């Protein structure tokens, strides 16, 4: 049947407040390919998000990478929100600084 996405949210480099960085949302192991991915800053969709082409895995699933430039601060929250038919509602995964 439908396969549920695995979602990994991570920065390129160890985060330092006030230093520009790249935030990534890597979504894997989903089927069918229809999916909606948003990267969020304080709950608001980030307008400048780059999406890789979607690829297919030999384990019978699709994967894709969203990323954006960001500057971490003490108070800003970042997340990736993923809507897929395998799930009853969109899943929000927070960037975890305790990472």
Swiss-Prot record:
Annotated localization: Secreted
GO CC annotations, alphabetized: cytosol; external side of plasma membrane; extracellular space; Golgi apparatus; HFE-transferrin receptor complex; MHC class I peptide loading complex; MHC class I protein complex; phagocytic vesicle membrane
GO BP: any one term: negative regulation of forebrain neuron differentiation
Transmembrane portions of the chain: none
S-S bridge residues: 25-80
UniProt keywords, alphabetically: Disulfide bond, Immunity, Immunoglobulin domain, MHC I, Secreted, Signal
Gene Ontology MF terms: protein homodimerization activity; structural molecule activity
Ranges of residues in domain Ig-like C1-type: 5-94
The protein's role, per its UniProt record: Component of the class I major histocompatibility complex (MHC). Involved in the presentation of peptide antigens to the immune system.
Subunit annotation: Heterodimer of an alpha chain and a beta chain. Beta-2-microglobulin is the beta-chain of major histocompatibility complex class I molecules. Forms a heterotrimer with MR1 and a metabolite antigen.
UniProt similarity note: Belongs to the beta-2-microglobulin family.
Full protein name: Beta-2-microglobulin
Source organism per UniProt: Mus musculus
Gene: B2m
């Amino acid at each position: 049947i439908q396969k549920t996405p695995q979602i990994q949210v991570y920065s390129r480099h160890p985060p330092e407040n006030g230093k520009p960085n790249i935030l990534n949302c890597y979504v894997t192991q989903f089927h069918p390919p229809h999916i909606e991915i948003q990267m969020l800053k304080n709950g608001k969709k980030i307008p400048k998000v780059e999406m890789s082409d979607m690829s297919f895995s030999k384990d019978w699933s699709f994967y894709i990478l969203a990323h954006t430039e960001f500057t971490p601060t003490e108070t800003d929250t970042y997340a990736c929100r993923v809507k897929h038919d395998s799930m009853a509602e969109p899943k929000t995964v927070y960037w975890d600084r305790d990472m």
